[PDB]
Amino acid sequence: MTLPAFKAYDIRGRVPDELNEDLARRIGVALAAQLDQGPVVLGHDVRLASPALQEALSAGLRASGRDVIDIGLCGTEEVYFQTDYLKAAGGVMVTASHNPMDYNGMKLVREQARPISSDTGLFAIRDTVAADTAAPGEPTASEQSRTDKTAYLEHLLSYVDRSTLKPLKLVVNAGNGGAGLIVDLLAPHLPFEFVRVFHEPDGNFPNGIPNPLLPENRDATAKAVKDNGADFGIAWDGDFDRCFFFDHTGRFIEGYYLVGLLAQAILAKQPGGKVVHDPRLTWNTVEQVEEAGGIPVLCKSGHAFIKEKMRSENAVYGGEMSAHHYFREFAYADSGMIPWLLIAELVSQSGRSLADLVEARMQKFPCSGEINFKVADAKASVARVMEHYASLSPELDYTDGISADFGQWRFNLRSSNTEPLLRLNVETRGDAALLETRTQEISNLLRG
């Protein structure tokens, strides 16, 4: 076996069982051998163990002759931005994003904030770490503290025309993660009225884990929107690389529809651009991109795949239905801040509420949302679905799992690689009844 903390795209584990200061220091040593020359940017989130793990990581890096730029408490996207902006050799964010309190982890990037994944260095780091029995060296390099967020803040504001913004009333819910610090730095430069919920960074998480998909967190944001007559509400996960929207009725907006909306917002500024999207839910995105005069580019889901595809296509924007939004101008990386600035600008300029913008698309392309099935045998469950629908002769595509297009409805079925878990997404052309029947039909086939 191997170190469980090392997953396909990042490091994640329970503290101190699977991730601790010694592993963090050894990761620092091993990372120094994988990067090109240059300093390494380090940041961390609000979790209690995060400063300790980042300092151990810094010690291991500086023991191997790497200068470290410590940007302190931050969101994950700030590590991406500063790594690119400072022309660093790489960057590490210490975070467990949205996971329980006993968890922590790291996201690693190399130059230009390109991801380090299991086949692009991460497992080379793992094997090095797993074989390193040597005694800790002494730091032979400097740590510079650079907590100024000015360039990051200026970059965020460049995406919108501030003279066109209306004074919207916005609920913001940092979930006691790091997002509220950025909101407060942006607030002097914007006309919005903010209603701050769960605002202060607090790694004890007195209001629950910063995971806006949990129904108790959803309800706190929705209630704040309705109680304050806000134009819309925004919630983030702990390291705020994901943002989630609530319209003025308090309705939680399914992330699929935001891809098409952000695409049309962006394409109004960069006409004719390419937009990368994933294959789970597609029809609404394709139509909104083409109507705005852009070119949709299908890609495998997963941030590593999206980012590489955006680079090879010079795509201006890429989005996933699971609340990941990537921007060419932002070093081809994801941000949980750019999306809501663009949406506030779209609401301001159009005179349409977020509800009306979303409602129109939901009626045209109703979707099931992503549905998970633990099964005994993934291959057998998939075969049972395929053979059942064979006589309708769907158009099949295998970009990411199996996509079957029947004309008036389609589905995508992906299998997890670790565990026997199937993920289902269904959508139709304007037919909510068909959506429900086919979704329950497939659900039965997947189960008993």
Return the range that interacts with Mg ion (CB under 5 A); candidates 168-176, 235-243, 250-258, 437-445: 235-243
CB of 275 to Mg ion, least distance (A): 22
Pick the closer one to Mg ion by CB: 82 or 97. Answer: 97
Q: Which is nearer to Mg ion, 26 or 107 (CB)?
A: 107
Closest distance of CB 214 from Mg ion, Å = 14
Q: By beta-carbon distance, which residue lies closest to Mg ion? A: 97
Q: How far is the CB of 238 from Mg ion (least distance, A)?
A: 6
- The alpha carbon of residue 139 and the mean position of all alpha carbons in its chain are separated, in whole angstroms, by 34
Figure out which of the listed residues 21, 239, 370, 400 binds Mg ion, where binding follows CB under 5 A: 239
Query: Which one among 237, 278, 370, 427 touches Mg ion, defined by CB under 5 A?
Result: 237
Asked if 10 is part of the footprint of Mg ion (rule: CB under 5 A), the reply reads: no
Among residues 50, 97, 117, 348, which one is catalytic?
97
Kindly state the tokens that stand for 336.
Answer: 């949980």
- Tell me, yes or no, if 97 is annotated catalytic: yes
CB nearer Mg ion, residue 237 or residue 320:
237
* Minimum distance, C-beta of residue 323 to Mg ion, in the bound complex (Å): 9
- If the CB atoms of residues 97 and 428 are measured against Mg ion, the closer one turns out to be 97
Q: Which span sits near Mg ion by CB under 5 A: 21-29, 81-89, 231-239, 342-350?
A: 231-239
Q: Which of residues 65-104 bind Mg ion (CB under 5 A)?
A: 97
For residue 240, the minimal CB distance to Mg ion (Å) is 7
Does 254 contact Mg ion by CB under 5 A? no
Q: Which is nearer to Mg ion, 106 or 357 (CB)?
A: 106
Write out the chain in H/E/C secondary structure: CCCCCECCCCEEEECCCCCCHHHHHHHHHHHHHHCCCCCEEEEECCCCCHHHHHHHHHHHHHHCCCCEEEEEECCHHHHHHHHHHCCCCEEEEECCCCCCCCEEEEEEEEHHHCECCHHHHHHHHHHHHHHCCCCCCCCCCCEEECCCCHHHHHHHHCCCCHHHCCCCEEEEECCCCCHHHHHHHHHHHCCCEEEEECCCCCCCCCCCCCCCCCHHHHHHHHHHHHHHCCCEEEEECCCCCCEEEEECCCCECCHHHHHHHHHHHHHCCCCCCEEEECCCCCHHHHHHHHHCCCEEEECCCCHHHHHHHHHHHCCCEEEECCCEEEEHHHCCEECCCHHHHHHHHHHHHHCCCHHHHHHHHHHHCCECCCEEEECCCHHHHHHHHHHHHHHHCCEEECCCCEEEECCCEEEEEEECCCCCEEEEEEEECCCHHHHHHHHHHHHHHHCC
- Provide the minimum distance between the beta carbon of 157 and Mg ion in the complex, in angstroms, as a whole number: 22
The count of residues interacting with Mg ion (CB under 5 A) is 4
Cα-Cα-Cα-Cα torsion 262, 246, 175, 69, nearest 10 degrees, comes to 10
Find the part of the chain contacting Mg ion (CB under 5 A) among 27-35, 234-242, 306-314, 436-444.
Answer: 234-242
- CB nearer Mg ion, residue 101 or residue 386: 101
State yes or no: residue 211 binds Mg ion (CB under 5 A): no
Separation of alpha carbons 276 and 267, rounded Å = 12
Q: Does 217 bind Mg ion (CB under 5 A)?
A: no
| Residue (210 or 296) nearer to Mg ion, CB | 210
320 makes contact with Mg ion (CB under 5 A)? no
CB of 116 to Mg ion, least distance (A): 17
Which residue ranges make up the site for Mg ion (CB under 5 A)? 97, 237, 239, 241
Q: What are the residue numbers of the active site?
A: 97
